[PDB]
Amino acid sequence: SMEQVAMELRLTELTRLLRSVLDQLQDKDPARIFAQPVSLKEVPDYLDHIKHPMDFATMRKRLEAQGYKNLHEFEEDFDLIIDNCMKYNARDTVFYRAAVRLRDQGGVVLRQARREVDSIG
């Protein structure tokens, strides 16, 4: 139907906007601490600690499969990256501090992203 095409056009547009948000957020991680899944080979007990792992590469895979239906779903996954890190790692580690910084700097980006999503529809 024509509706479903228009639908898919918007979803495709959303994906385009989210790809830009994702690139902007990942730029706030120049150390690439959050770029890839936590290695289960190098951290074999990770899943005992963290029930829903997340990372930027995994977000990107879902993004290109157009698997984010709205900004909220995208934001949930970003929050997982931060929150998982701040649980597993102690307050005085480079990892925890990198998560705090990413959350603070990412807030700016996500704030305008929400406006753009509502605005454009």
Over its C-alpha atoms, the chain yields an Rg (Å, rounded) of 16
Contact status: 95 vs ligand 8UG (CB under 6 A):
yes
Contact status: 25 vs ligand 8UG (CB under 6 A):
no
Contact status: 59 vs ligand 8UG (CB under 6 A):
no
Binding residue for ligand 8UG, selected from 18, 33, 71, 102, defined by CB under 6 A: 33
Contact 56, 99 (CB under 8 A): no
Token pair for 57: 């590469």
For binding to ligand 8UG (CB under 6 A), which residues are involved? 33-34, 38, 84-85, 88-89, 95
